[PDB]
Amino acid sequence: AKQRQTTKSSKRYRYSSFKARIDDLKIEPARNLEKRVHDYVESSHFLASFDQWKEINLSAKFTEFAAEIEHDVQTLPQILYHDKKIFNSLVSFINFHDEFSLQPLLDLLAQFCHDLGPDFLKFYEEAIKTLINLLDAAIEFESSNVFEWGFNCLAYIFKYLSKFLVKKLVLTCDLLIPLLSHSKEYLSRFSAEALSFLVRKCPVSNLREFVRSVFEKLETNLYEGLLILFTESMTSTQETLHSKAKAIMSVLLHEALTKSSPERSVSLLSDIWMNISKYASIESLLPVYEVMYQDFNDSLDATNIDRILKVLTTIVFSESGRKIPDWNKITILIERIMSQLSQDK
Amino acid sequence: ARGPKKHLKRLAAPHHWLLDKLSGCYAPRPSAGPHKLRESLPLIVFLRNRLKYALNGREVKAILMQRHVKVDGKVRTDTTYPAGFMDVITLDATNENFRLVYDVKGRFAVHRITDEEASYKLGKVKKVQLGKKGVPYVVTHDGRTIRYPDPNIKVNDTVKIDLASGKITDFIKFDAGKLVYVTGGRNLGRIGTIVHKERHDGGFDLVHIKDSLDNTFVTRLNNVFVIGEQGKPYISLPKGKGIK
Amino acid sequence: AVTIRTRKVISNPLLARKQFVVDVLHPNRANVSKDELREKLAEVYKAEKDAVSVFGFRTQFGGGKSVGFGLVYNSVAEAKKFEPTYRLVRYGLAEKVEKASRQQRKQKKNRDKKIFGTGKRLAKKVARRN
């Protein structure tokens, strides 16, 4: 408990608890670099994966599912013409929650969306609802493999429908609130990662609408979920940050400092800053630092006098002082605050 | 010897396993379990030499440790677990359910069954007695001790056991005209209806059996297993229907 | 040209793989390297080369044909989990473990058997004695 399995034994096979698998699991399909069957296609992604799964999986449910839909997926026009029946069967069989057949069905659902992206939008609401019920169902029978399949299916859909979902990112977030706010820590954590991919793909203008909505929700566990969402979006690789991180922080910082936003939002930004401060090295934080200082200088006002202080206190404290580049800037800043509050802060 | 043996020579192994004589020097010794050594099929032989799912002993061990194999609804991890007659072997990953029934040749056959049929098994009542506190019980051929049995159940009758609960759902009396499966001797694997039971006090009883093809043969009562009423067996039978 | 055909294909979800008999027809060639066959079965089944293993190739008398066994695992992780260590070493997926010969290890085992406990007390006792 106190110490994780940092030192590995010489054994080739080792027992791993369900919780242990979940902690290591991370939803980011693009990170995986194993060959994907759907990369090679003759007719459509669905058929390519559908043929493969027929030959690997032998479960009772999947075999029955294949028989119904085998005749209607031979050609892409056939899939498009029969899209309605295919989706209903996929949802119907996923509802059975049979672990022996979830993996092919869930994979095909994602690839189904791949074949007809814009036309899958009318199916978008029902697909997410079915996954949410499955994941909520997944809690009672412990299988880390099921969670990986379900969220990877969710991540794939976002990848294929990235353009359309981004335009209405708040709507996609609204569906996943029960997951992001769920009692279990890891369900919110996983759902945050899947939605984080959309966030980093969001235009700045659309992002400002998205951040306003989520902060408006803040005023159970939604606070923790959002913290994972934003920090995951900013973090890209060890000791480094995503290129969009600077744009996200500026959008986040502006909304938090705005008087309309609740104080809880500023606390989130404080928590978001602390996480990225450790994850990133000195160099990757320089662009992020500059936007904070400029925005603080530009938006310093009596109404937001406290809030700029609360964030600034987080900056000086984070990892002690090692991550802050050049400190005259804070001294120049703190002079401005006193020139323009809460004594305790 | 100064104790129980722990090795088995391939030439000494039961013939009906059909083990290659040149593959090695030793054969799997069945561990203690429900079925006797000579009338059992260890899981390693079944998984490797019959289904061919595993190519070597280590692969069979790996399969078992994954807990993919269930015997009579219970997970078994012993490579040499002695599965035997009327045993239900379930592989969920392959969606396969097997019942171990000898063929006309006299060897265990790879007989696939449905889930509904796999939900139960048949047991020959080897003994009926009162236990402690005056609780009646029946001991079957597979070593199952079942308490509170039906009073009508006697020795040599067949009880239908539900695997999930291990209780008696129904039973079939030993009587003339009942359908019978031979589990011993040269007539092993044949199926026929009883005609007469010759009873010799202090000796082995003999049963005359008549096949569908009108042929008759006599077998010791110990090799007899009642499986249902004529033309209406309670278990799916293998190909050939125990003829010849 | 050179042809490969897979026959007797059995899906084995127990070990999470596909096992088959590989027949390679190679007119006007000595024989075909295992690595090429791994690459090409990988391309065929749309799986990683790391997930494909082949063994037991015997050229038919007179040449022109070879027959052996092949395995294609559902994932490279599954192959690393279930494959024999020596086969993993052949394909480079695993590193050969360096160990002393059997005689040396057995002699060391006997010598360690003769000594009881850690032995540092014996060391200090002999150091004092001499």
């Binding site: - | 359910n97 | 040209a1 050179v2 042809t3 490969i4 088959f20 090409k40 065929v44």
Partner: peptide, 19 residues
Amino acid sequence: PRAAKKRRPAAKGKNLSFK
């Protein structure tokens, strides 16, 4: 009761050529 129906093989042979 009837026995379970045999399942047609899921996998089939496959071929290529090179060089």
